[PDB]
Amino acid sequence: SKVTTVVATPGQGPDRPQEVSYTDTKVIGNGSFGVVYQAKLCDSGELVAIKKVLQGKAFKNRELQIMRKLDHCNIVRLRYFFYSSGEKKDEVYLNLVLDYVPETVYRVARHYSRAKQTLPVIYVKLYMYQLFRSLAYIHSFGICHRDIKPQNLLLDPDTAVLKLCDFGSAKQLVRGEPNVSYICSRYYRAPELIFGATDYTSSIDVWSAGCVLAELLLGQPIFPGDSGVDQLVEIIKVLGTPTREQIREMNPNYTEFKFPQIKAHPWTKVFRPRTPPEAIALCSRLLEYTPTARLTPLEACAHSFFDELRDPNVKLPNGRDTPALFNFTTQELSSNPPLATILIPPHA
Amino acid sequence: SKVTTVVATPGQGPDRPQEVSYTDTKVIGNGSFGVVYQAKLCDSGELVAIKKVLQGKAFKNRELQIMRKLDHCNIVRLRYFFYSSGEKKDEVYLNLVLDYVPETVYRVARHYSRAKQTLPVIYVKLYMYQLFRSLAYIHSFGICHRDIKPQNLLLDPDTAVLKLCDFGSAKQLVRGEPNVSYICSRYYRAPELIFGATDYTSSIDVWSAGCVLAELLLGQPIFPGDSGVDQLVEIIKVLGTPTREQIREMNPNYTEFKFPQIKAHPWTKVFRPRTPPEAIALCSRLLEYTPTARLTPLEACAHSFFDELRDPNVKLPNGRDTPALFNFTTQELSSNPPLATILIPPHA
Ligand SMILES: O=C1Nc2cc(Br)ccc2/C1=C1/Nc2ccccc2/C1=N\O
Ligand SMILES: O=C1Nc2cc(Br)ccc2/C1=C1/Nc2ccccc2/C1=N\O
Ligand SMILES: [Cl-]
Ligand SMILES: [Cl-]
Ligand SMILES: [Co+2]
Ligand SMILES: [Co+2]
Incomplete structure (x- = not known):
């Protein structure tokens, strides 16, 4: 589809805002905590998953809080996360860019x-x-x-x-x-x-x-x-x-x-x-x-x-x-x- | 199938043990409170439903207790009920013979x-x-x-x-x-x-x-x-x-x-x-x-x-x-x- 470019933060490691562009977005999952899309990182060609949940901004997101803390070969890796907004005002989204598994x-x-x-x-x-x-x-x-x-x-x-x-x-x-x-x-x-x-x-x-x-x-x-x-x-x-x-x-x-x-x-x-x-x-x-x-x-x-x-x-x-x-x-x-x-x- | 004859009690009305024979038994429902069969009353040809639940005999069956009390055109009618036993000892069943609906x-x-x-x-x-x-x-x-x-x-x-x-x-x-x-x-x-x-x-x-x-x-x-x-x-x-x-x-x-x-x-x-x-x-x-x-x-x-x-x-x-x-x-x-x-x- 279209190309999308955001400022993202790495999941684990030093908090250094970086530029990320991805494309080929399609939906591949739903939930009571948001939607999950598949996507392709532009410059590396890698496939990732992006889970988009609505965020209160007035309250931390525990899913993010926990994911940042984990790191084990049997737990899906969080690559970056970033916020975005929607058509309506006072409506921010938290986006988790994770590894994609088939x-x-x-x-x-x-x-x-x-x-x-x-x-x-x-x-x-x-x-x-x-x-x-x-x-x-x-x-x-x-x-x-x-x-x-x-x-x-x-x-x-x-x-x-x-x-x-x-x-x-x-x-x-x-x-x-x-x-x-x-x-x-x-x-x-x-x-x-x-x-x-x-x-x-x-x-x-x-x-x-x-x-x-x-x-x-x-x-x-x-x-x-x-x-x-x-x-x-x-x-x-x-x-x-x-x-x-x-x-x-x-x-x-x-x-x-x-x-x-x-x-x-x-x-x-x-x-x-x-x-x-x-x-x-x-x-x-x-x-x-x-x-x-x-x-x-x-x-x-x-x-x-x-x-x-x-x-x-x-x-x-x-x-x-x-x-x-x-x-x-x-x-x-x-x-x-x-x-x-x-x-x-x-x-x- | 085979013909079955039991001594049953009427649901509502005077408690007068009477003889009932039914045949053409097939299963038509299941539940955590027993099985429901369809059957035909021999002498009248009427189709009925029989729900068979395992009974403690040491404790009353509330389903029966409630059903005996009801009588309204929008609630399925209990015709009779009777007990029976199974292959194993200390294993009695309560059987509710109710109206059958298509x-x-x-x-x-x-x-x-x-x-x-x-x-x-x-x-x-x-x-x-x-x-x-x-x-x-x-x-x-x-x-x-x-x-x-x-x-x-x-x-x-x-x-x-x-x-x-x-x-x-x-x-x-x-x-x-x-x-x-x-x-x-x-x-x-x-x-x-x-x-x-x-x-x-x-x-x-x-x-x-x-x-x-x-x-x-x-x-x-x-x-x-x-x-x-x-x-x-x-x-x-x-x-x-x-x-x-x-x-x-x-x-x-x-x-x-x-x-x-x-x-x-x-x-x-x-x-x-x-x-x-x-x-x-x-x-x-x-x-x-x-x-x-x-x-x-x-x-x-x-x-x-x-x-x-x-x-x-x-x-x-x-x-x-x-x-x-x-x-x-x-x-x-x-x-x-x-x-x-x-x-x-x-x-x-
Ligand atoms: O590859 C993935 N990384 C994820 C990270 C999180 Br957290 C949640 C889902 C996924 C995910 C998914 N990959 C899939 C492949 C087929 C069907 C559904 C999914 C899916 N999700 O529904
Ligand atoms: O005709 C019926 N009298 C009942 C009384 C009680 Br109490 C529970 C069930 C029935 C019942 C049923 N009739 C059916 C017809 C088609 C599929 C399932 C059922 C059924 N039951 O699953
Ligand atoms: Cl190993
Ligand atoms: Cl009327
Ligand atoms: Co869920
Ligand atoms: Co049930």
Whole structure:
């Protein structure tokens, strides 16, 4: 289309206003925190993504605030950001120029589902492993994503690299201070969120990540449900009824409800027959009523399901090498050093 | 299929165990409160619906308790109910034998949407009017449905009669006693429910009923949204941002959230051009942040949008007469007598 030139600031590094020109703008996503366009940086030819949200100017943008702080190979990189205005007065926009990634787990999963097939287990391990790695990263800053779903997981089909994106709902959780329970995409909401909890923790990202893993093994969302009551019923049909204890660990003030019938179901009678034992094991360890009983993200990466990735021979199905998975920084493993012995293979 | 014979009790009237035989059982619905089959009563040939829910036997079934109490031409009739057992011990089922209705607003709406068309406004008036009439009825018993959605609105395409069904989530609300906020189908949840409210009132059925009306005029759900945050954003784009007052009327204890941008949108820029002014008016009067500011169900029936139904000539598009709409009982209008002068036409 037309060429656009703005004064932008780099995301990370020294704050030095610089000139940026981009073109070939098309829309490629929407959200309750703005539009996402694809674009081409003029002078380098590189494709980028620009997310445009309306800004109050009277209040900071937390998405920007968080993004500036991150830097990890599994989280989409913020290149620059700039403001702009619209047709109407007192109407400023914040624009985040981020790396552009070709696919998203949501599409790759839909594409396979449409083909009446399941995603090759090797991809399942690779995508899920990188999701947990990122999850551990942002949690170590005390940041909870609050919106983990397949559409927010970017993929590069060729390199098999996954990148967490959309920090629109992200927030740094602090003990004692309350949080709204209405964030997070239906199918991925942790029980505590459905129950109204406002004192939940980062472990809600793990429940979600677990919903993603299960969805990738089943070919459809594992806990669908129009109402929260239906989701709770789907969940109870797989984990069994919650003990009074558990319901309390999810949401202290809670308000009792009916429910009852069926309890402690076959976790193995959930997935297709060929489903790898370890994949089901990881799910159980991820979808737990008690939030503190859920594996942490780093412990998830150390799970046996991800052993193939640690294998010295491992290669993508297209003969190419696997993405970065062991280059853990000391800071990255400091939350649970002992894991290093499983995280970093012998040949490293 | 096979013939089945049970000892059943009549829903309404004297409790006199009687023998019932039915056959031609097929499934026709599912839910978090049981399965719904279609069946044929042997000796009369009549088609009925049987909803089978697992029962605790140690606790009453509120759905049954409520259904026994109702009796109104716009609410599906309970004919009998009986218990039965399953393959496993300590596993009893409660079976509700109800009237069978051919269609549901959900299908009629999908069918038209598929045909790339909108439901004829006359049907919109007829269906919505009967929904409100029923809604007024159950509210007068202090019963809030809690699950008003198109799939729970049964229709008889020929007679154009609508019948409210599925009282699985229904409950008699009492001031002071708390209620869970996770009932109700996503798209139809009143803001107070999204905000976590546990002291909400029957007016939540009205917000839903309003979502239905709007969906029937647009051809798709008016407030879609994966997360509650997205729904709130869709809602704010049509009603404008909630004043601090309003947010308080929805949920006293609430926990603040980000949000902001856009406010007070064109209620008329929402629907197609040909959309009747009055239909949009009714919607505004139904989708109100402040719950007490929402029209009551009976006032909704008295709205101008429903004037065509009061017209002396009015006939279904198939030349047949319109269903019952004015036979209000004195008990029915006692909540707001003055409405009688608009409810019951001159020629009545
Ligand atoms: O390449 C991207 N970088 C992003 C950064 C953020 Br933050 C949000 C989205 C994107 C993004 C996206 N890339 C896509 C490719 C196909 C379909 C949708 C998207 C998308 N987004 O919807
Ligand atoms: O005719 C009916 N009486 C009912 C009473 C209760 Br309570 C719940 C459902 C029904 C019901 C139903 N009739 C249908 C016709 C087509 C598709 C679904 C249904 C259905 N139900 O899904
Ligand atoms: Cl590596
Ligand atoms: Cl009449
Ligand atoms: Co969003
Ligand atoms: Co239901």
